[PDB]
Specification:
This is part of a larger assembly, with chains A, B, C, D, E and F. By secondary structure, chain B is α+β, with helices and mostly antiparallel strands. Chain B is 23% helix and 25% strand. In chain B, helix 3 (153-169) runs antiparallel to helix 5. The termini of chain B are far apart. Chain D has one domain. Helix content of chain D is 11%, strand content 16%. The chains are: A alpha/beta, B alpha+beta, C mainly alpha, D alpha+beta, E mainly beta, F little secondary structure. The structure holds magnesium ion (MG) (13 copies). Chain B binds one RNA strand through strand 6 and helix 3. Chain A: Its main location: cytoplasm.
RNA sequence: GGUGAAAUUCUUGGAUUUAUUGAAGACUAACUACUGCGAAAGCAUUUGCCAAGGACGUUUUCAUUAAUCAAGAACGAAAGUUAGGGGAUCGAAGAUGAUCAGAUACCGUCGUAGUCUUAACCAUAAACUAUGCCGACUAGGGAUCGGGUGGUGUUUUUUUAAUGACCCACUCGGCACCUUACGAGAAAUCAAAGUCUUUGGGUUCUGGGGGGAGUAUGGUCGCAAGGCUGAAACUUAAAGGAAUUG
C-alpha cells in the first residue's frame, strides 16, 4: 500500500539536514540542507530554511516512488548540546503537510556514558 | 550560504534513479508480518553483481509493525539480509533494541536502576549479549518516598537475573529466543525469582545484540521462509 | 595589583637574584 | 559575610563531588552546586500535533516525548531567566514554584 | 502566485522592541478549523481578514 | 670531522655539512650518508599516528 | 563548518550527511539525593581474590592499659620534575582568523607539553565548616542512613510458617534540616560561636595597628621549580570587621 522511507532529520544549530533514505538506510534520496535555500550564512538554522529544505525532500520522493517515511530527529549529541536545533522541528511539520505519511517517530540523538571531554576549558566559553 | 563556494574542484549528468530496481524485504517465520518493505539497488551489470551489493544490508523495523499490535510499540527489531532470490531478499534476526523514549521514560529518580548483561552462547553457536534492566518500586501502603535497594539485594538481583538469561538461551537455538522475547516470558519469569528479594517494577529486559554468527548454512534460513 | 601576581612577580625576581649571585660563587 | 549556610551547594560530608560541565558555556561546576533542570517535552509541538495526526499511519500513534537533564552554571542560569536573584528572606525558601 | 485569505479570531498582544508589531492568531477562511498565528505591522482588530503571501510558518509567539 | 676525499660531509673551514643531510632512496653507494629517505626530521612531538 | 556577525578551515580528488564494520585511548552519564564511605586528599559499570573498617547486638574477656601532644613519622587535589609505556579527547606554549585606536586578551581554527599509566620526586590549595581535639550539661520537631527490639500489623512463597519488602512504636550511632532565643555575639549570625567580669573540666597550636614583608640574610630539605624557618633599616594615623541611609 505505502512505500516507506526514513526521514533522518538532523536538527542542529547553524544548519539543518533533511534527507530521506531506504528502510535499510544505505541508499539515500533527496539530500538537501537548510543552508542550500537561504543565502545568509546565518539563517541556515532558521525554521523557514528547514521548511524549504523539507519540501524539496518530499518533492523528490514522489518521483522516486516513496509515499511515506519514518522519522528520526537528531541533535548534535556527543559532548555537544543534545538539544534539537530551531529549524529541525519545522522541517518535520513541512514533511507531514507535503502529502507524505509519517510513522515510527523516534529521537536518535547520540548520548554518551560520560564521554571524554567537552571543549571550552575549565572556566567555560567567556563571551 | 549558496553563492559562497570558493572552489569546487581541487585539481581544476544522468539521473541515478533511472538505473535502480526495487526489491522486497521478507521477515522470518517467527513474526506475524513478512512484508517489511522495499529497498533500492542499481541493476546488476556484468561486473557489479548487485546481489552481492545487497547481502550485507541490515534493516531496522518496529516489532509493532511485524506483530500488528502496538503492545510492542517500542520493541525495535533489526533484520540482516542473508540471501537474495527473485526480488524476495530474505532476512534473519540481527538484534532487538529499545526506543530512546521508552528507556528515557522508565529511568526516574528516587528508585534504583539495576542492570545485568551476559555473554552466553546459544545452541546454534550464535553468540549473544543480552542486557537486562529493572527498577525498584514503592510497595502498596508505603510512606517513605524513595524505596532504594541496599546494594546487596542488587547483587542478589543481578546474580539471579544472570542465571535466568543464560539458562533461557542455552537450549534454544535462535528462533525460540526470537519467539520468547515476543511474549516477554523472560520478563515475567525474572520477577517470580526476584519478587522475594525486592519488588522490581519495569523488568522490560533490554536490547539484545549478536556478537558472531556461525557458518551461513543456507538450508537453515530457508527453513524459516517456508 | 593582585596578590597572586605579586607572588609571581617576586618569584621571578628571586630567580634572577639567585642567578646574579651565582656569578660570584 | 557568609551569604548562605550551604554556601553555594549541597556538600555536607562529601569532600569532593567530581564536577560536571555546563550545557550552555562548558564551564566546570560541581554537581551539587549545579542548577539541574529536567526538560520533558512532547516530540513535536502543541501546534504540529494537529497536522502530524491525519498525515500519519497508525492513527493516534503515541505522541512520544523527549527527556533531557540540563545543567547550568551560576552565571548561565541568572542570564537565562532562571533562578536569577531573590531577597534576603526569600533566599531561604527551597520549595519549587 | 497563490495567496491565502485568513480571518482574525483573537489578538494576543504587542511584540517587538518598540511594540509596533502585533501578535494575532487567525483562522483560514477556506480549509477552516485550521489556525495560524502571525505577526502584523499595522493596527489589527478582531474579525479582520489577512492576506498571507506564504502561510506555512508558525510566527514566533512570545511566551 | 673528515676531509672531503673521505666523506660527503668532509671539508670546510668550519665543521658543517653544507647540503641537506636527507638523502634520496635512489642515491648510489657513496651518496647514502646521513638520513636515508627520511620522511621527516627534527624532534618527534606527539603521537606517531602509525 | 563555526559566530552577535564573519573569516581562517574542509569540499566534483565527493566535503558535510547515510549505512556496514574495525582500531585506539580516555571516561563511568541518566539512576544521583540538603543520601553513603574514608584521617584528610578523596571515592560512582560488572565479577573474582586480598586485607581493612565504623556502628549495632552482647549477662564474652582484660583491666586503667587513658586524653592532648615539642621533637619525630605516614598519607597528602591540581599543577610541576625524572625515566619508560601510551598518546583518542581536551589543551599552558606556539601558529592563525577576527574584534579593536591598539588586543602579544576574551571569540574561532589548528595545536606542543600536559592530560592517562608504571617506578621515583615535589609536601602546596579559599587543603574551608575560613570554626583544633577529648569530656559533661542545657529547648522543642519531623525526616533520613546503618544496626537492634516489640507489635495476632500488610503483601509474595506453600491461602498458610521462617525469611524478603512495607506500616506503627522505641532505641543506639551518623549526614544534615526546621522553629525559637534560655543564652551568646560588634553585628551578620550561632544548639554551638551557649553553661565566659556570677570570669577556672583537660590539652595543643597561633595573633598583638597598617605597610616594608613572608622581603633580605643565614640555615635546612628538593634534581629543579621551590618548601620550612625568618628579620632589620625605613614609613605611616589610620588600614580593617558587620550593619545603616543614600
Ligand atoms: Mg559581598
Ligand atoms: Mg560521502
Ligand atoms: Mg548510597
Ligand atoms: Mg556506571
Ligand atoms: Mg591520643
Ligand atoms: Mg597553607
Ligand atoms: Mg580540600
Ligand atoms: Mg536518628
Ligand atoms: Mg531507625
Ligand atoms: Mg552519615
Ligand atoms: Mg599591640
Ligand atoms: Mg602586626
Ligand atoms: Mg564592609
Amino acid at each position: 500500500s505505502q512505500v516507506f522511507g526514513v526521514a533522518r532529520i538532523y536538527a542542529s544549530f547553524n544548519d539543518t539536514f533533511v534527507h530521506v533514505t531506504d528502510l535499510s538506510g544505505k541508499e539515500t534520496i533527496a539530500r538537501v540542507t537548510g543552508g542550500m535555500k537561504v543565502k545568509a550564512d546565518r539563517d541556515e538554522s532558521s525554521p523557514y530554511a528547514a521548511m524549504l529544505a523539507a519540501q524539496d525532500v518530499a518533492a523528490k520522493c514522489k518521483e522516486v516512488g516513496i509515499t511515506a517515511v519514518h522519522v528520526k530527529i537528531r541533535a548534535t549529541g556527543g559532548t555537544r548540546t543534545k538539544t534539537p536545533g530551531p529549524g529541525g522541528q519545522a522541517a518535520l511539520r513541512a514533511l507531514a503537510r507535503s502529502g507524505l505519511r509519517i510513522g515510527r517517530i523516534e529521537d536518535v540523538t547520540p548520548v554518551p556514558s560520560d564521554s571524554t571531554r567537552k571543549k571550552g576549558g575549565r572556566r567555560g566559553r567567556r563571551l | 550560504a549558496v553563492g559562497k563556494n570558493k572552489r569546487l574542484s581541487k585539481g581544476k549528468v544522468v539521473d541515478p534513479f533511472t538505473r535502480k530496481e526495487w526489491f522486497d524485504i521478507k521477515a522470518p517465520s517467527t513474526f506475524e508480518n513478512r512484508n517489511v518493505g522495499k529497498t533500492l539497488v542499481n541493476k546488476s551489470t556484468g561486473l557489479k553483481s548487485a546481489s552481492d551489493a545487497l547481502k550485507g544490508r541490515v534493516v531496522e523495523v518496529c516489532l509493532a509493525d511485524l506483530q500488528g499490535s502496538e503492545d510492542h510499540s517500542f520493541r525495535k527489531i533489526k533484520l540482516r539480509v542473508d540471501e537474495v532470490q527473485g526480488k524476495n531478499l530474505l532476512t534473519n534476526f540481527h538484534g532487538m533494541d529499545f526506543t530512546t523514549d521508552k528507556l528515557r521514560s522508565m529511568v526516574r529518580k528516587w528508585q534504583t536502576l539495576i542492570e545485568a548483561n551476559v555473554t552466553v552462547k546459544t545452541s546454534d553457536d550464535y553468540v549473544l549479549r543480552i542486557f537486562a534492566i529493572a527498577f525498584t518500586r514503592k510497595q502498596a501502603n508505603q510512606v517513605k518516598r524513595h524505596s532504594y535497594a541496599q546494594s546487596s539485594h542488587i547483587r542478589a538481583i543481578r546474580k539471579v537475573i544472570s542465571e535466568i538469561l543464560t539458562k533461557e538461551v542455552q537450549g534454544s537455538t535462535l528462533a525460540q529466543l526470537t519467539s520468547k522475547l515476543i511474549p516477554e516470558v523472560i520478563n515475567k519469569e525474572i520477577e517470580n525469582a526476584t519478587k522475594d528479594i525486592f519488588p522490581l517494577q519495569n523488568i522490560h529486559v533490554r536490547k539484545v545484540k549478536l556478537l558472531k554468527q556461525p557458518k551461513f548454512d543456507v538450508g537453515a534460513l530457508m527453513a524459516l521462509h517456508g | 595589583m593582585r596578590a597572586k601576581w605579586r607572588k609571581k612577580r617576586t618569584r621571578r625576581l628571586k630567580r634572577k637574584r639567585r642567578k646574579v649571585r651565582a656569578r660570584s660563587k | 559575610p557568609k551569604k548562605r549556610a550551604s554556601n553555594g551547594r549541597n556538600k555536607k560530608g562529601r569532600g569532593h563531588v567530581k564536577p560536571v560541565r555546563c550545557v550552555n558555556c562548558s564551564k566546570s561546576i560541581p554537581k551539587d552546586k549545579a542548577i539541574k533542570r529536567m526538560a520533558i517535552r512532547n516530540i513535536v509541538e502543541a501546534a504540529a500535533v494537529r497536522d502530524l495526526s491525519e498525515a500519519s499511519v497508525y492513527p493516534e500513534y503515541a505522541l512520544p516525548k523527549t527527556y533531557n537533564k540540563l545543567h547550568y552554571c551560576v552565571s548561565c542560569a541568572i542570564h537565562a531567566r532562571i533562578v536569577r536573584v531573590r531577597s534576603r528572606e526569600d533566599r531561604k525558601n527551597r520549595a519549587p514554584p | 502566485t497563490p495567496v491565502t485569505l485568513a480571518k482574525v479570531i483573537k489578538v494576543l498582544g504587542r511584540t517587538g522592541s518598540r511594540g509596533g508589531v502585533t501578535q494575532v492568531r487567525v483562522e483560514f477562511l477556506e480549509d477552516t478549523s485550521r489556525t495560524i498565528v502571525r505577526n502584523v505591522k499595522g493596527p489589527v482588530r478582531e474579525n479582520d481578514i489577512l492576506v498571507l503571501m506564504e502561510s506555512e510558518r508558525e510566527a514566533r509567539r512570545l511566551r | 670531522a673528515m676531509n672531503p676525499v673521505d666523506h660527503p660531509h668532509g671539508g670546510g673551514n668550519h665543521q658543517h655539512i653544507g647540503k641537506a643531510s636527507t638523502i634520496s632512496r635512489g642515491a648510489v653507494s657513496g651518496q647514502k650518508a646521513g638520513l636515508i629517505a627520511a620522511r621527516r626530521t627534527g624532534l618527534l612531538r606527539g603521537s606517531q599516528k602509525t
